[PDB]
């Protein structure tokens, strides 16, 4: 038993709800929220802009040191860094941005990452602003995630479209 509500379970380990996952992860407080990070950790929009504001900028801040010692990560990657005040930690996972011409096919290697974690609150990854079909990242994150994820989707049209033709 965890303390998610009002998820609507898809499969044995996956459940989603229209809700902002700023909200969310201040809420539950969960072991691990995702951020839908670029290969620099530059957090400027989307789910990255959120998150960061929400955390002041002490995402940012410490992202520029992680990338200041180690380079930027690969698309298809990850780092866990702190969650602030709003997780634990954060999985700041690459997804493909089809808006920059990057490879859609990079996306299941994207979720393999959340696999390294019991648990998580996460978005759907390449999708919004990063030009993805959504549907698709939807399907990918259901056939490649085996442990527990509980997805935040903010735009209510986009959850409601997402239920509505989920197989
Ligand atoms: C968090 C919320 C307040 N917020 N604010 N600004 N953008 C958003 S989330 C829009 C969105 C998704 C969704 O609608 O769930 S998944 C997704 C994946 C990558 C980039 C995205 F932008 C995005």
Same mark, same amino acid.
């Given at each position: 038993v965890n303390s998610f509500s009002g998820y609507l379970k898809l499969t044995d380990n996956v459940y989603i709800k229209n809700a902002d996952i700023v909200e969310e992860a201040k809420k539950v407080k969960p072991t691990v929220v995702v951020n839908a990070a670029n290969v620099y950790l530059? =957090? #400027? #929009?989307?789910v990255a802009g959120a998150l960061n504001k929400a955390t002041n900028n002490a995402m940012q801040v410490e992202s520029d040191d992680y990338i200041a010692t180690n380079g930027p990560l690969k698309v298809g990657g990850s780092c866990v860094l702190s969650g602030h005040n709003?997780?634990?930690?954060?999985?700041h996972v690459v997804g493909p941005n089809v808006n920059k011409? +990057?490879?859609? /096919?990079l996306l299941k290697s994207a979720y +393999?990452?959340?696999? /390294? =974690? +019991?648990v998580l609150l996460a978005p759907l990854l390449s999708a919004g602003i990063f030009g993805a079909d959504p549907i698709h990242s939807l399907r990918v994150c259901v056939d490649t995630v085996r442990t527990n994820v509980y997805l935040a989707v903010f735009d209510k049209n986009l959850y409601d479209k997402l239920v509505s033709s989920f197989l």
């Open positions: 530059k =957090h #400027g #929009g989307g709003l997780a634990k930690h954060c999985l011409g +990057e490879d859609i /096919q +393999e990452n959340f696999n /390294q =974690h +019991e």
